[PDB]
Amino acid sequence: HYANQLMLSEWLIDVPSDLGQEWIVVVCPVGKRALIVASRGSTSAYTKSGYCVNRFSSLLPGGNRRNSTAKDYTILDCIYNEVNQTYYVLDVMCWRGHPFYDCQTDFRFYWMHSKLPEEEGLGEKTKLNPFKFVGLKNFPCTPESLCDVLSMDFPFEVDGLLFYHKQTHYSPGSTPLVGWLRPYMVSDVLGVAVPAGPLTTKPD
Numbered sequence: 381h382y383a384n385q386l387m388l389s390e391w392l393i394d395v396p397s398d399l400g401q402e403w404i405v406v407v408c409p410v411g412k413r414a415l416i417v418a419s420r421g422s423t424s425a426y427t428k429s430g431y432c433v434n435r436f437s438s439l440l441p442g443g444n445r446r447n448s449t450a451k452d453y454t455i456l457d458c459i460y461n462e463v464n465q466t467y468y469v470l471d472v473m474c475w476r477g478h479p480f481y482d483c484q485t486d487f488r489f490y491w492m493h494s495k496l497p498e499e500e501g502l503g504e505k506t507k508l509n510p511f512k513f514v515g516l517k518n519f520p521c522t523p524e525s526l527c528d529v530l531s532m533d534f535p536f537e538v539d540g541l542l543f544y545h546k547q548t549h550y551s552p553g554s555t556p557l558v559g560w561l562r563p564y565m566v567s568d569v570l571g572v573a574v575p576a577g578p579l580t581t582k583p584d
């Protein structure tokens with residue numbers, strides 16, 4: 381079935397000792413989690429719960445009129461952002477038929493840092509690509525980096541931060557090797573200094 385296909389995070393309560401040297405953080409936009417599947421001709425979006433929420437065309441190698449082939453299917457882990465009609469790419473499980481489930485995440489993240497941009501107008505709205513696909517940036521988890529990101533400006537309403545272990549592979553379901561925290565939470569839970577501002581402002 382198409383359900384339980386996305387790797388899920390857990391609240392990050394315990395702080396990994398090798399955090400700054402073995403983990404990377406991703407700032408996530410507000411939106412809906414989605415399994416994306418481009419296969420022979422078209423692209424389909426599934427919910428975390430497994431059912432299709434859309435079937436359209438995209439500039440992904442998988443489905444599309446112009447660009448298609450056998451086992452040329454591509455599978456992504458995305459967060460759909462309504463206000464921007466954009467599918468923010470979080471992870472890649474399979475590209476052009478090359479599976480990446482058994483690969484460590486820092487490889488997966490780097491592999492999309494360069495292969496997504498290589499697709500002509502993937503980042504723009506177009507007749508064959510009505511929905512934009514934009515890869516999310518990941519950063520180091522050193523104190524300085526965390527401060528950098530927490531003071532950065534994003535083209536979307538930030539929902540939270542995901543913490544990935546560089547070594548873990550891709551396995552569907554919740555896992556401790558992937559952490560989650562609202563931005564205004566890092567100070568307490570991660571015991572570090574942080575730049576005052578929108579992203580670090582706690583709710584009272």
Ligand SMILES: CN(C)c1nc2c(c(=O)[nH]1)N(C)CN2[C@@H]1O[C@H](COP(=O)(O)OP(=O)(O)OP(=O)(O)OC[C@H]2O[C@@H](n3cnc4c(=O)[nH]c(N)nc43)[C@H](O)[C@@H]2O)[C@@H](O)[C@H]1O
Pocket residue numbers: 387388389390391408411412413427428429539542554560
């Ligand atoms: C709690 N947690 C560990 C967590 N929460 C997350 C994320 C995340 O990575 N981790 N996100 C990427 C986002 N998120 C929160 O869950 C919401 C999920 O909404 P969305 O996936 O876009 O719509 P959807 O139709 O899947 O919504 P669901 O019925 O699942 O209802 C939302 C609930 O799913 C659960 N959930 C979603 N993602 C995760 C997740 O990744 N881990 C865990 N443990 N739980 C999650 C939470 O209870 C969340 O409140 C987000 O809006 C945000 O409030």
